[PDB]
Design a protein around this ligand. Structure first.
Ligand SMILES: O=C(O)CCCC(=O)N[C@H](Cc1ccccc1)P(=O)(O)OCC(=O)NCCc1ccccc1
Lengths: 211, 218
């Protein structure tokens, strides 16, 4: 499988630099270009620059020439982008992408949050119905920074799911998700919320129990 | 630099209709080698861009043939036949003829589906959260259309406004509806001081609100 692996997130202090990694597998890392793309929440894509791993030849978008430095480690098949003196304008999702012949493959992207605040793990709460179909929920409250990844029954249950975008309020994020199944199905068959928060290396599971 | 212009910030179509997305370049993308260096990608919320078209008119493997790309040397079109829920997202063109590589600003596809009233569900604070010291009451307003909707919370019959946190999803990838989650956060003492909790949803599909409620000590 051709794949590019990127960390889900990086919390960086204002003014400090950050070095993003992009680990490649599934093809010969040295023979293809690694490109880097920036995307602010809700905005469009921007090309930052690229590098040829076998030789480290690089091209930069003038706009990012004084901000980014691209390198690679052929011995670990990893590409890196170091960004200097971050400010709030650097908060964004940064993707790495390669090009094999005509085909580009993208990493899942790293969400860089420039902040002086400390990383805070979420409190995950199961939402069972008040003491046809039934709707269950999961509340992921008070974390920072973005993002969190939420699934149900480890990704097995995906139909009838609504995962709401995280909303920032009082300097902490809150996100929630609901899932609707046939009532005869629950609680006989368990339903569990799996929440992962990259920045705090935490991954929790909350089984929804009847009240 | 080559300027890639996508004239339409957004385009609305109702499910089933065909649609065309335009992108223009400030200079011909047709190389002397005969290839036209233009890509079209679809990006869905929270996903990395996905390849649709390469070489201006080649359909990428795995992409439904409802999609196609054509163009002159500077005017390009991405055509989507029989638009459906999974096609909603932002479409981007990209030229890779010359450095620096440049993207179009993107065109958002919006699906104007049929109106639908929200299905509401209310949830009291979890025992875990209460033990923890706080109390959040959640209401989900699901699968409704259009996007505009309002929620009012009432504690013991009186409207409560501070402590509310609302969030709308993007159009559902399967039925193109929207859903919204509203969370009322109180202190545990506050929560334990009242009994009747209600969330009322008003959507244009009706003048009377869809409401759900519960009594704490029942
Ligand atoms: O100097 C020149 O004539 C060409 C300069 C651009 C270039 O080398 N493009 C290459 C194709 C090409 C070949 C011959 C003539 C024109 C274009 P190329 O697209 O392989 O460039 C290497 C590269 O890194 N491309 C990345 C494109 C890409 C960027 C970000 C996301 C997805 C795709």
């Amino acid at each position: 499988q051709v794949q590019l692996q990127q960390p889900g997130a990086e919390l960086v202090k204002p003014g400090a630099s950050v070095k993003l990694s992009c680990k490649a597998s599934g093809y010969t890392f040295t023979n293809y270009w690694i490109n880097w793309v920036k995307q602010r929440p809700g905005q469009g894509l921007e090309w930052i620059g690229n590098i040829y791993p076998g030789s480290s030849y690089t091209h930069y978008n003038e706009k990012f020439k004084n901000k980014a430095t691209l390198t690679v480690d052929t011995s670990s098949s990893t590409a890196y982008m170091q960004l200097s003196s971050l400010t709030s304008d650097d908060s964004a999702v940064y993707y790495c992408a390669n090009k094999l012949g005509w085909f580009p493959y993208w990493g899942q992207g790293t969400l860089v949050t420039v902040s002086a605040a400390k990383t805070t793990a979420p409190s995950v709460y199961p939402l069972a119905p008040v003491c046809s179909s039934v709707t269950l929920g999961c509340l992921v409250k008070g974390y920072f920074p973005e993002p969190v990844t939420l699934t149900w029954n480890s990704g097995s249950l995906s139909s009838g799911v609504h995962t709401f975008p995280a909303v920032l309020q009082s300097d902490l994020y809150t996100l929630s998700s609901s899932v609707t199944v046939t009532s005869s199905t629950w609680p006989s068959q368990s339903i569990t919320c799996n929440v992962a928060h990259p920045a705090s290396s935490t991954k929790v599971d909350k089984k929804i129990e009847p009240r | 630099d080559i300027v890639m212009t996508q004239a339409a910030p957004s385009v609305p179509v109702t499910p089933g209709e065909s649609v065309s997305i335009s992108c223009r370049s400030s200079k011909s993308l047709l190389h002397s080698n005969g290839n036209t260096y233009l890509y079209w990608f679809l990006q869905r919320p929270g996903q990395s861009p996905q390849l649709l078209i390469y070489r201006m008119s080649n359909l990428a493997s795995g992409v439904p043939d409802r999609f196609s790309g054509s163009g002159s040397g500077t005017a390009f079109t991405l055509r989507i036949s029989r638009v459906e829920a999974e096609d909603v997202g932002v479409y981007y063109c990209l030229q890779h003829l010359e450095y620096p590589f440049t993207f179009g600003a993107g065109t958002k596809l919006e699906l104007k589906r049929a109106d639908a009233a929200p299905t509401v569900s209310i949830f009291p604070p979890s025992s875990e959260q209460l033990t923890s010291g706080g109390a959040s009451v959640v209401c989900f307003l699901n699968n409704f259309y259009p996007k505009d909707i309002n929620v009012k919370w009432k504690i013991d019959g009186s409207e409560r406004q501070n402590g509310v946190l609302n969030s709308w999803t993007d159009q559902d990838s399967k039925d193109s509806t929207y859903s919204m989650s509203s969370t009322l956060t109180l202190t545990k003492d506050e929560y334990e001081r009242h009994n009747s909790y209600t969330c009322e949803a008003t959507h244009k599909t009706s003048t009377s609100p869809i409401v759900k409620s519960f009594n704490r000590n029942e």
